[PDB]
Amino acid sequence: CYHGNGQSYRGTFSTTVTGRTCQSWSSMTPHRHQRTPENYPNDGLTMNYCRNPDADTGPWCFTMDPSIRWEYCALTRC
Ligand SMILES: O=S(=O)(Nc1cnn(C2CCNCC2)c1)c1cc(Cl)ccc1F
Ligand SMILES: [Cl-]
């Protein structure tokens, strides 16, 4: 589980609520985005792990589905 809004989550879960797979933060495929570990070196944007780097309300990720830019991950708040 994650604490609070999930900003501090550093777990290795990488699956969305609909069962889709998280895109890697450093990847621009399928989604070209700017929430990269280059840009945000201190938000734990490792591999494709679920993260909340932008003060959303739970960890999320860009998805490997070109039609769905991002989703929340299948995680619960502690
Ligand atoms: O690369 S992104 O982070 N893409 C993006 C679009 N929606 N989201 C949501 C992710 C979950 N938290 C709410 C924003 C992220 C992004 C952020 C901003 Cl401020 C502007 C453009 C942009 F491309
Ligand atoms: Cl946490």
Swiss-Prot record:
Glycans are attached at A74. Residues 1-78 form the Kringle domain. Disulfide bonds join C1-C78, C22-C61, C50-C73. It comes from the Eukaryota. N- and O-glycosylated. The N-glycans are complex biantennary structures present in either a mono- or disialylated state. The O-glycans are mostly (80%) represented by the monosialylated core type I structure, NeuNAcalpha2-3Galbeta1-3GalNAc, with smaller amounts of disialylated and non-sialylated O-glycans also detected. Coiled coil: none annotated. Belongs to the peptidase S1 family. Plasminogen subfamily. Apo(a) is the main constituent of lipoprotein(a) (Lp(a)). It has serine proteinase activity and is able of autoproteolysis. Inhibits tissue-type plasminogen activator 1. Lp(a) may be a ligand for megalin/Gp 330. Disulfide-linked to apo-B100. Binds to fibronectin and decorin. Apo(a) is known to be proteolytically cleaved, leading to the formation of the so-called mini-Lp(a). Apo(a) fragments accumulate in atherosclerotic lesions, where they may promote thrombogenesis. O-glycosylation may limit the extent of proteolytic fragmentation. Homology with plasminogen kringles IV and V is thought to underlie the atherogenicity of the protein, because the fragments are competing with plasminogen for fibrin(ogen) binding. This is Apolipoprotein(a). It comes from Homo sapiens.
